[PDB]
Structure formats: structure tokens, C-alpha cells
């Protein structure tokens, strides 16, 4: 698996939770996206490929998958206490991130 899959995965499992019931199912979803997120994290985006590793666009982009996993977490930390709805919300919020901080190296 790759960034290309890792982004698609936090795509269908953004999916997952929106379409979840309960807070099982979102928690399982939240925990897929912070395997994702934790292996995309690692990778080099393309449009990266000839920067320095400590580059500030490498940085932009791992930065943006650390505020993503605490995103996650505190996603995480509402479905362990039941809020599916609540949860619902904030993986909606992961998006925002995604789409800003992200996007634009892939």
C-alpha cells in the first residue's frame, strides 16, 4: 500500500462513519484512518519527490498528518464514550484538514 492507497482509505472509511450507527462501528472506521494516517505520514507526496526530507513542505505535510491523528484521536475519544453523533461530526471536521494541509502535495 501506498500514499495514493493510504489516501483512499481515509476516504472510505470517512464513508464508513458517516453512514455508521453506532459507536462501535465508528471507532473501527476512526481506527483504520489512524493506520492510514500514521503509514501516509511516512511516505514522500510526489510533488515532494526532489525536496530535502526536512524541507518546510515535508514538514507541512507530516505536520498536517500529526494534527490529523490528534484530530483522530479526539474523534476516538468521543465514540469510547459512546457519542456516535458527536464523532460523526469531528470525522467530518478531518476533511478540513485533510483537504488543507494535504492536498496540494499529492
Given at each position: 500500500?501506498?500514499?495514493?492507497?493510504?489516501?483512499?482509505?481515509?476516504?472510505?472509511?470517512?464513508?464508513v462513519?458517516?453512514?455508521?450507527?453506532?459507536?462501535?462501528?465508528?471507532?473501527?472506521?476512526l481506527?483504520?484512518?489512524?493506520?492510514?494516517?500514521?503509514?501516509?505520514?511516512?511516505?514522500?507526496?510526489?510533488?515532494?519527490?526532489?525536496?530535502?526530507?526536512?524541507?518546510?513542505?515535508?514538514?507541512?505535510?507530516?505536520?498536517?498528518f500529526?494534527?490529523?491523528?490528534?484530530?483522530?484521536?479526539?474523534?476516538?475519544?468521543?465514540?469510547n464514550?459512546?457519542?456516535?453523533?458527536?464523532?460523526?461530526?469531528?470525522?467530518?471536521?478531518?476533511?478540513?484538514?485533510?483537504?488543507?494541509?494535504?492536498?496540494?502535495?499529492?
Amino acid at each position: 500500500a501506498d500514499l495514493e492507497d493510504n489516501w483512499e482509505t481515509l476516504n472510505d472509511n470517512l464513508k464508513v462513519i458517516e453512514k455508521a450507527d453506532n459507536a462501535a462501528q465508528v471507532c473501527d472506521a476512526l481506527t483504520k484512518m489512524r493506520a492510514a494516517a500514521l503509514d501516509a505520514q511516512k511516505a514522500t507526496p510526489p510533488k515532494l519527490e526532489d525536496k530535502s526530507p526536512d524541507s518546510p513542505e515535508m514538514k507541512d505535510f507530516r505536520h498536517g498528518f500529526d494534527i490529523l491523528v490528534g484530530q483522530i484521536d479526539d474523534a476516538l475519544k468521543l465514540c469510547n464514550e459512546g457519542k456516535v453523533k458527536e464523532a460523526q461530526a469531528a470525522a467530518e471536521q478531518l476533511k478540513t484538514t485533510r483537504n488543507a494541509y494535504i492536498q496540494k502535495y499529492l
